[PDB]
Amino acid sequence: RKQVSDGVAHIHASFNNTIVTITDRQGNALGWATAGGSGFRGSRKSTPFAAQVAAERCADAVKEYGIKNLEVMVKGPGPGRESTIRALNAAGFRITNITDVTPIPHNGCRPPKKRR
Amino acid sequence: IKVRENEPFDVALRRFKRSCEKAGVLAEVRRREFYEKPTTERKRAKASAVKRHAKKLARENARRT
Amino acid sequence: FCRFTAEGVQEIDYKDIATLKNYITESGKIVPSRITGTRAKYQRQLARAIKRARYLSLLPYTDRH
Amino acid sequence: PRRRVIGQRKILPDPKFGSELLAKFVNILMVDGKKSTAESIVYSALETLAQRSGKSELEAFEVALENVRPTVEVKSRRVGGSTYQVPVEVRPVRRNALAMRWIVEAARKRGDKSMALRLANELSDAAENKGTAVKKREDVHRMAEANKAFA
RNA sequence: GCUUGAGUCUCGUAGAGGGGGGUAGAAUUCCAGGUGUAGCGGUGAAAUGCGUAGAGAUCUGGAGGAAUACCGGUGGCGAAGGCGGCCCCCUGGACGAAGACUGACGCUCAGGUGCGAAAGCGUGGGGAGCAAACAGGAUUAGAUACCCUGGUAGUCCACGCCGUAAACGAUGUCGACUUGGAGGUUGUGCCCUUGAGGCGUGGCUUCCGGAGCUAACGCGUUAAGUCGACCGCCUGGGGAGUACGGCCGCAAGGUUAAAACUCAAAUGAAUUGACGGGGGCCCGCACAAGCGGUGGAGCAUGUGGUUUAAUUCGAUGCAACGCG
RNA sequence: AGGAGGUAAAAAUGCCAAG
């Protein structure tokens, strides 16, 4: 193992599913866990609780690296956000800084027409 | 958007993204160009704004509170 | 509620990054005229000033650069 | 109902030894308003369990409650579109009252000889939590914990 | 002749007005690579789809096309259609101040000519994202649909064509006159700019409302008020903006535009109801929380049906069926 | 006062009835 101390937690809180990827500072991924992997196939993965267990299931996937300092990068509309950060704080990580990297275009691509 | 405040963290309390978007530009560009329904939903957004401004300046009757 | 160059008269120049920093937010977006109480003439003026200053990298477009 | 939030009843305590919680238990065992028949079953099953348990009557009884006393249960609530099951915490007055019901329906399914023998068998093996009465409590906790996503 | 109408000059101001050429950042997709591990994606829920050939996630690098977040506002400009990043070049119109000038040069306009959203058509490009058609998966009695996964034409550019729209303030243009209030926006004068003020005066614009008008709704100095000039148009509904003919068009079609026959109505605004898979509030063993039943069995009894010489008549969703 | 949301915010199907 490389045993890095400071790392970055990325959170892809989409409307249907949430993906918690913990990387190093450079961006190389170390481990991840989603709401679909924790069970909860269907409507249950779109809830804040499945985001919470996805972050916990990602915390013990990087126990072999000994990360102690996490900077959170949340991205997405989903209900994951304000619950999957609290699961990292209870997991025994020091939250150095939070930021949202939610990709907002400066108006151009045509979005879909969908859902009458 | 970006949050540190650097010493006494203890709690998220991100009003910061709510002070800019938090959903408002993202639950808008989720779909549906429409290209003219903005022009009509902006209009009733203004029409309901100026009607309640006419309403709050027309509350004084008695109503016996 | 307060004012701007309606009293401290100006014909806004984009190179005055000290004054222009007051009229963007922490994410770099232009703050609306309903907040600062700027006259609509000058809000058009500093919108062109900020848009020029973003081009010369004197002001950032976002905070995520 | 719609309007009334009515206060509960006034149960008189048990005549053998004064306890409303046992007195509530004989009502759930009762059928057809025959209370003297049901009290005959309770006392004859509590004494033949207190010999097997060693503990005296009430404390031998109430220890068999916590193995069937639940703590969360599902309810079918609709707020958005289609309806799903939310696990809710059981209020304490209901909590043992739901436990007493699960026992006497488990004892009624028991294939023993008499109701006194049936209920004493069910109330004893629930103190070692192996009966079907605890299996009701385990299966209400499984589907509650399967639906822990809703709170 | 005259100067008020109309116009010219001087000086400024505001503006997504137009045409051309540059360039900017955000994002999507693709391409390549690093890390990394079993899912991702999607939905009411699913599946199709994508993924151990290592996706999704994350990071770096690149290539492309298209649109311009925030400003942004019943804000602005334009004859209308319309027009939003920034910068330059070319260019139109509007408005204001203070004067000067021309001297009725004006208004309207059939035919005519020009402009004219989107879709479409022609030729040549371009093609990220969306997406008719189409395909697959669902849903469903069926589902040629809504929903999902893909996806060609198209959307973009150049140059022609089409010439239509709920092209709408469903309100032709021009002029005059006739109480008010609150705003927005853009000029300008004067005074103590003494300070964001005070006082005026123009242009455009939003809302409310008086008289008046209107069938009513409503309009209400930006009139649907009071008048004048000119133009377009209407004459019951259906047949029908169709047929035929002409003209126009590459075509799709447009434009002009009937009749036979048929009905005694079609329609407008408002009113009281009822209803809504509209909204708010509330109630009832209505649901929920419970307990005991019925539906199975055997009888009792009533009805339907069938049968009979007759099975007397009546009661028939709830509110007939141990009912008269 | 306007703005944003909130276990939450919906959207599964749901045809017909004759003078």
Curated annotation (Swiss-Prot), chain A:
Gene Ontology MF annotations: small ribosomal subunit rRNA binding; structural constituent of ribosome
Keyword Ribosomal protein: yes
Superkingdom: Bacteria
A GO CC term attached to the entry: cytosolic small ribosomal subunit
An individual GO BP term: cytoplasmic translation
UniProt entry keywords in alphabetical sequence: Methylation, Ribonucleoprotein, Ribosomal protein, RNA-binding, rRNA-binding
PROSITE patterns for the chain: RIBOSOMAL_S11
UniProt entry tagged with the keyword RNA-binding: yes
HAMAP family cross-referenced by the UniProt entry: Ribosomal_uS11
Protein name: Small ribosomal subunit protein uS11
Organism from which the protein derives: Escherichia coli (strain K12)
UniProtKB/Swiss-Prot annotation, chain B:
Source organism, top-level taxon: Bacteria
Keywords: Ribonucleoprotein, Ribosomal protein, RNA-binding, rRNA-binding
GO biological process: cytoplasmic translation; ribosomal small subunit assembly
Keyword Transferase listed: no
Species per Swiss-Prot/TrEMBL record: Escherichia coli (strain K12)
Gene name as annotated: rpsU
Name the UniProt record assigns to this protein: Small ribosomal subunit protein bS21
Record's compositionally biased regions (Basic residues): 43-56
Family: Belongs to the bacterial ribosomal protein bS21 family.
Lineage of origin: Bacteria, Pseudomonadati, Pseudomonadota, Gammaproteobacteria, Enterobacterales
Pfam annotation, one family: Ribosomal_S21
Purpose of the protein: Probbly involved in recognition of ribosome rescue factor SmrB in stalled/collided disomes; fusion of protein fragments to its N-terminus decreases ribosome rescue in the presence of SmrB.
Curated annotation (Swiss-Prot), chain C:
NCBIfam families attached to this UniProt entry: S18 (TIGR00165)
Record's subunit section: Part of the 30S ribosomal subunit. Forms a tight heterodimer with protein bS6.
Molecular function terms, GO-annotated: mRNA 5'-UTR binding; small ribosomal subunit rRNA binding; structural constituent of ribosome
Protein name: Small ribosomal subunit protein bS18
Keywords: Acetylation, Ribonucleoprotein, Ribosomal protein, RNA-binding, rRNA-binding
HAMAP family: Ribosomal_bS18
Function comment: Binds as a heterodimer with protein bS6 to the central domain of the 16S rRNA, where it helps stabilize the platform of the 30S subunit.
Short name of one Pfam family: Ribosomal_S18
UniProt signal peptide: none
Family, similarity comment: Belongs to the bacterial ribosomal protein bS18 family.
GO cellular component terms given for this protein: cytoplasm; cytosol; cytosolic small ribosomal subunit
Domain of life of the native organism: Bacteria
Gene encoding the protein: rpsR
Swiss-Prot record, chain D:
Assembly with partners or alone: Part of the 30S ribosomal subunit. Contacts proteins S9 and S11. Cross-links to IF3 and the P and E site tRNAs.
Full protein stretch here: 2 to 152 of 179
GO CC aspect terms: cytoplasm; cytosol; cytosolic small ribosomal subunit; membrane; ribosome
A GO molecular-function descriptor: structural constituent of ribosome
Keywords: Ribonucleoprotein, Ribosomal protein, RNA-binding, rRNA-binding, tRNA-binding
Gene that encodes it: rpsG
Keyword match Endoplasmic reticulum: no
Protein name: Small ribosomal subunit protein uS7
UniProt entry tagged with the keyword rRNA-binding: yes
Source organism of this protein record: Escherichia coli (strain K12)
